[PDB]
Amino acid sequence: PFLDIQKKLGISLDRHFMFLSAEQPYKNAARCHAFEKEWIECAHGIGGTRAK
Amino acid sequence: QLLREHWVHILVPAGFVFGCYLDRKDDEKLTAFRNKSMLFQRELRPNEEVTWK
Amino acid sequence: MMNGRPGHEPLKFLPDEARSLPPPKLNDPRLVYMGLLGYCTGLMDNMLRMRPVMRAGLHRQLLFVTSFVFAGYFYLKRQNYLYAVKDHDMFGYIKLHPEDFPEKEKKTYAEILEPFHPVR
Amino acid sequence: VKRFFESYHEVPDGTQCHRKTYITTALGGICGIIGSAYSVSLNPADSTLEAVARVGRYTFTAAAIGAMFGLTTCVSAQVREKPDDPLNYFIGGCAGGLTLGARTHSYGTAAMGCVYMGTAAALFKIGKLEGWELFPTPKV
Amino acid sequence: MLKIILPSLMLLPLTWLSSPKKTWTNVTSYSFLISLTSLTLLWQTDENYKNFSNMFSSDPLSTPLIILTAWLLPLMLMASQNHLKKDNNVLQKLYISMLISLQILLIMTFSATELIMFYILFEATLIPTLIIITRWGNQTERLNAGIYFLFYTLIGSIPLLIALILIQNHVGTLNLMILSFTTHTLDASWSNNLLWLACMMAFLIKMPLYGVHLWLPKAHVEAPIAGSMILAAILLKLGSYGMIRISIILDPLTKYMAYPFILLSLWGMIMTSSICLRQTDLKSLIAYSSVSHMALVIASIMIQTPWSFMGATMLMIAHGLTSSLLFCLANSNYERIHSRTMIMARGLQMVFPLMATWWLMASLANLALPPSINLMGELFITMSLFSWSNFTIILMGINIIITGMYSMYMIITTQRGKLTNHMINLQPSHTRELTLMALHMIPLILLTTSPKLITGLTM
Amino acid sequence: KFYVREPVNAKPNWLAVGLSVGASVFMWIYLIQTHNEDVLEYKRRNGL
Amino acid sequence: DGPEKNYEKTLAILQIESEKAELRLKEQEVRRLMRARGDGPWYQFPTPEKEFIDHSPKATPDN
Amino acid sequence: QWQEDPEPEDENVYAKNPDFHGYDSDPVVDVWNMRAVFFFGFSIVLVFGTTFVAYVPDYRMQEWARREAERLVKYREVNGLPIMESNYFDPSKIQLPED
Amino acid sequence: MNPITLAIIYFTIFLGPVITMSSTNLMLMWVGLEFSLLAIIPMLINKKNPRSTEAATKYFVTQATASMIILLAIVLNYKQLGTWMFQQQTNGLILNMTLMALSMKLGLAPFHFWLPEVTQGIPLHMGLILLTWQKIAPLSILIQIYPLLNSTIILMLAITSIFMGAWGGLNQTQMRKIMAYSSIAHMGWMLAILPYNPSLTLLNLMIYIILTAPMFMALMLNNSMTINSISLLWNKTPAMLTMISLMLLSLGGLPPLTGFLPKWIIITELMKNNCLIMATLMAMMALLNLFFYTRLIYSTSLTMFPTNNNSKMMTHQTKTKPNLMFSTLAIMSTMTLPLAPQLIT
Amino acid sequence: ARQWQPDIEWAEQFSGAVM
Ligand SMILES: CCCCCCCCCCCCCCCCCC(=O)OC[C@H](COP(=O)([O-])OCC[N+](C)(C)C)OC(=O)CCCCCCCCCCCCCCCCC
Ligand SMILES: CCCCCCCCCCCCCCCCCC(=O)OC[C@H](COP(=O)(O)OCCN)OC(=O)CCCCCCCCCCCCCCCCC
């Protein structure tokens, strides 16, 4: 986000459904749940250029 | 009452003494090389602490 | 371009590391110019509302000067913090990658042969 | 068409003058149909017959400018046997400007086209010799 | 230098806080004190350049220009305080503010140690002279003259900014002394040629070069007297100063790239002196004389000889003083007869004897009478140009002949001859304008007596 | 009474004047205070 | 004050401009290298957050 | 026609004030502004400033370089050394490329 | 217009862009833009004149088409990557859809044909709110995706934006259309500097806003609708001609005005990324922008256009329209250039 | 002697919405 009120106050208005392994109703995992789980935790903390 | 009438005559002399003041601060700032220039290496006389001010 | 740095607090004005910086001396050309800008703002306000330029609204001119120096001081603290962390990250990258920044051996004017171009 | 416009630069200047004239005529025709489409869309004609006539006139004019520009550039380069020289492209730019002035029927536009298109083609030559980047990727 | 800048800054509160019956007196007296204060920059007892601070410095070339600007500022006030008598007090104070701001910004411009600050101050001086010309000009054409002047200068100056940013990215700091010490030879490639042309074209425009000089005659014709002073005596010399500063990083390709501009300067001074022979406007004639003299300055700066640089510096100062004096005389006649026609007023030798003496001495300075600094600059420019190429003497001699021709034609048709007896409204003389005449002529005498002050960087 | 209508600025707005003076003095005290503890934090963190 | 004041002030000015120039050059090279391969603090382009991934057991085992 | 004021005629300023000096309309400001430009322009600048720059010593080391040249001519002529060497720099301190 | 609808519409106008900046989701940025559009339509049709109806209709159809191209790009990304973010490997076709839609959101050329039309026929306050507030949320989305954009089409859009804006500003006489073409040129500058550093993009946006607000305010004081109307400002309000001249010179980018600083630092980083031809063309078109600014100054301040009889009662009456915010924004838009290192991050 | 200022025709050259 361009402004980070969301990160500053700790509230999550829309950050909990960005992607497939996010909050799912009644624990029904989306398709390719583990596969993009691996993609996020590979890319976390290394930046966009290193992620590619 | 004359100091009210002719108070504008001191502004330009105030700028002159202020201009000379800030120029003195410039000499204090740009003094990384007091007595370190290789052309002016002389040992300091016993009555002085700096070569120039 | 520095918003993605590690340890960056989101939407933070002056973090605690900024408190390690020297504050502005409060009588410097930047804050003096900001106060003069506030005085000019008050004078302009008086002329536009068609009052005496400096004989009217002395409290307004005072508030303009105080607000301008306040904003200038805190903005100046933030900018010195930003430039400090810019130079800090630059030097940290320099020491982190020394093979990408080799110390060149600049050679004197006894073996460098610069061309001579006569003006005749 | 990217491979085509790259194949323009495959050979040094003064060689395959016919190929250079053909490719620059094609590029001028593309620029002409773009400009004519913009003209007929922004300013609509009273009928489709004169609309497509205006498209044809603009396309023919731009194609003629590109054709004689590339032709004169190549022939000047091979007559002076000096391939990488911007003055050849300046001569081509004035040839394009004189074609523009002839199609517009005004010597003032002819002279302005000479000076402006000669400068543009000369700076294009300097860019393609000394590695100028028109739309660079961000590096810093 | 900062002790020069600050009291000139406080001149503006003095202007806006003085009484309406004392503003002219206070500002003129304190600007005379500014000139006296700025005279201290000639204390150069050693070869090293007076680096006052990290952003201000003085040089043997920058010092006479600063002293000249500080000297013309009270002259600008004295000449302008007659056509502003039928004027509002706020507008009078605003005009004085424009003159003081021009003086301040030009002093910082000449004392600059950084080319990008030189550019910022370049447009900072570009603004208020436009304001002066457009607001206080007399005829309809002042708006067209302001447009011509402004946009010639801007279209010149943008490629200068482009080249400055590129060379700053190339070397690192763009400071004058760092450039002068770590100067690198260019590879004489096409990109370097375009870089040279970009960084030269601004100063060549504002000199002005021949062919691009069309803004100058209309600017001086439509301008008031103070605007004519500031242009013809400071801003052309500002363009020359810019070339002398920036030419040090342009070796060696300036050797061949100087060719079209030397030719343009020589033929331009020939044709502009011809215009001075055939011109029906006094202000236009003085303006075209300024174009010819600045063409000499261009030729010297382009050939890059120590004699050429020294003669360029002395011609800078001499032409600034004598052009301001000639414009002052023309403006005095203009407030007399309310007309700028060259031929209309003829027999002023009778009615104005001492003003005719000032006319004669001004034109004698104009045609480079010995041993004046006008002749010193013109002759040393001839010396360096003849060293550069022997056939420059023909064009130089034709220019000198036509220069003497138009100066004596000015004197003969404006002072000598039968008096136009229908001109009833010929006021005898003002002590104000006569004092202005003497304050223009006496520094010429003093600089003739001691020409070592204005030699410049080289010699 | 000179004017035929009462001006809106005939009498000074005393609440506005008091708020202006109070805000100015409060910001001056706050500014000098933050300058002092910034100086003290500087010296206590760098040992000066 | 004499020539030595101007001489040593000029030396200080030239020094300060020299470190300013060489620091600007290294700043340009650092920015170029970081844009080429972002591995320092600057130019770290965003990435979706890891902490919004469920690790609890779900309805289907094949996840 | 549009309601414009007529052209103002410039009157003879010497008619009301025969001792006019060019500076301002009323005689009191006229004579004092005259006295300012003479005392601050001619008196303290054209005389004191002329005297100040007349007594600047060793302007760009001109008098020093004459005295040092006379010293060096004295030093070289009594020892057989040439007045001027052809090379400013000693060639032993310059290492030329091998080819 | 009652206070209830005034509060609802103004709060939605505020809430749209704030949602767009604060929100991570492409969906929520799209709905923030949607909020801004629906909130600002009634204030364009507030005056209920046929010109206002035309402006509202043109603005609505243009903004709706741009919103749906944005939505196409968002849904195509969500199909391709399964997320709600242009992260790193989203398709260049999708990104070009986003860029075209956001450019026609903004009103820069060749999508600029509606902006003078929309800003004409509406009151000056809503032209100000449009040309300042409505161009932050598309800039928020564009700044969010700066490294992924295609620099070629970015630079081409920018340079044609500045060319068309400069030519339109030279041609037009109406003050609202002059402001629209000035807007188009400034968005060309921001769009060009966008891929290299969004910090200078935001700096130029703030400088443009703080220059455009007080000039619009000076237009509000007398509803000076035309060059003649701003020309008799010497008889209407003579104490502001100096600030009018200074604000228009700062909009032209003459040094030492602080409006020279965004153009100067943008050109500086353009040379840092080696696009000298681009920067030179942009700077000469900025000179042309300065030309029509200088002609406006010639009309309004340096010359004194003939006045009419009823301006005597205009001088008889008194006005308190110039608010407390005008002078501060004018001074920060005029004399801020020595604070350039503090303005630049 | 008076400074020229715009008249009716110079003031009317700016009206017409096209210039
Ligand atoms: C007042 C005169 C106006 C017209 C003449 C202006 C100056 C003419 C010479 C300069 C070219 C134009 C300005 C660009 C300045 C570039 C300076 C520079 O950095 O050069 C090196 C650079 C080269 O970059 P480089 O030096 O980094 O090269 C790197 C080289 N290698 C890779 C080998 C290490 O040159 C350019 O980038 C030039 C691009 C110019 C593009 C724009 C041209 C437009 C047309 C010119 C005139 C336009 C206005 C007049 C129109 C008609 C009016 C009647
Ligand atoms: C620096 C940049 C200046 C830019 C313009 C400035 C304008 C404002 C000026 C304000 C006042 C500053 C005056 C500056 C020059 C002062 C002249 C001066 O006194 O020079 C010093 C000189 C003695 O110096 P010295 O070193 O002995 O001479 C060389 C010997 N090696 O002293 C002398 O020789 C004595 C001088 C005074 C005595 C009277 C001289 C009368 C000369 C009569 C000449 C007659 C012929 C004139 C022909 C003119 C033709 C046009």
From TrEMBL, chain D:
GO terms for biological process: mitochondrial electron transport, NADH to ubiquinone. The keyword Protein transport does not apply. Disulfide bonds join C17-C74, C94-C114. Keywords: Membrane, Mitochondrion, Mitochondrion inner membrane, Transmembrane, Transmembrane helix. Pfam families: Tim17. It is a multi-pass membrane protein. It comes from the Eukaryota. Its main location: mitochondrion. Signal peptide: none annotated. One of its GO terms (cellular component) is respiratory chain complex I. It is found in: Mitochondrion inner membrane. Belongs to the complex I NDUFA11 subunit family. PANTHER family: NADH DEHYDROGENASE [UBIQUINONE] 1 ALPHA SUBCOMPLEX SUBUNIT 11 (PTHR21382:SF1), NADH-UBIQUINONE OXIDOREDUCTASE SUBUNIT (PTHR21382). Accessory subunit of the mitochondrial membrane respiratory chain NADH dehydrogenase (Complex I), that is believed not to be involved in catalysis. Complex I functions in the transfer of electrons from NADH to the respiratory chain. The immediate electron acceptor for the enzyme is believed to be ubiquinone. Complex I is composed of 45 different subunits. This is NADH dehydrogenase [ubiquinone] 1 alpha subcomplex subunit 11. The lineage of its organism: Eukaryota, Metazoa, Chordata, Craniata, Vertebrata. The gene is Ndufa11.
